[PDB]
């Protein structure tokens, strides 16, 4: 009788830590202390920095750079770091 020995050849695909690009991080400093006045809102302090991710209109969804939290924050209560003067 004949004979045969099995043995497949597993494979896979995936790229490593390919170079990065396309940055984006709107940093805004709280112009005034905020403790989530209304629902759906993040709480911060006057001088706290947040990473604005989404900016629908006024309130933007930034992540507190203190607790790495995530929630909507008032723009009228923040000021882009690159929007500071003297």
């Amino acid at each position: 009788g004949p004979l045969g020995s099995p043995g497949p050849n597993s494979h896979n695909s995936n790229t490593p830590g390919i170079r990065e690009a396309g940055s984006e991080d709107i940093i805004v400093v709280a112009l005034y202390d905020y403790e989530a006045i209304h629902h759906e809102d993040l709480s911060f302090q006057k001088g706290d920095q947040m990473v604005v991710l989404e900016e629908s209109g006024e309130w933007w969804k930034a992540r507190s750079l203190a607790t790495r939290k995530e929630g909507y924050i008032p723009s009228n209560y923040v000021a882009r770091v690159d929007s500071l003067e003297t």
Binding site: Y32, G57, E58, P74, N76
Partner: peptide, 12 residues
């Protein structure tokens, strides 16, 4: 999210 006409600006 634009739901409220921004919060009431404080003093300092």
């Amino acid at each position: 999210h634009s739901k409220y006409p921004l919060p009431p600006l404080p003093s300092l």
